Amino acid sequence: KDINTIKSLRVLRVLRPLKTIKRLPKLK
């Protein structure tokens, strides 16, 4: 794979879950 596609595992599991959590006290 590529380090970037490893960051797809990282960054997408950062952005998406956090929006789902942080939408509550950090709504934007």
- Secondary structure, 3-state, 1-28: CCHHHHHHHHHHHHHHHHHHHHCCCCCC
SS3 8: helix
CA distance 3 to 27: 31
CA distance 25 to 4: 30
Q: Is 25 exposed, middle or buried (0-12, 13-18, 19+ CB in 10 A)?
A: exposed
SS3 21: helix
Number of C-beta neighbours around residue 7 at 10 A: 12
Sign of the alpha-carbon dihedral angle for 21, 22, 24, 28: negative
Q: Taking CA 27 as the corner, what is the angle to CA 25 and CA 28, rounded to the nearest 5 degrees?
A: 150
How was this one solved?
NMR
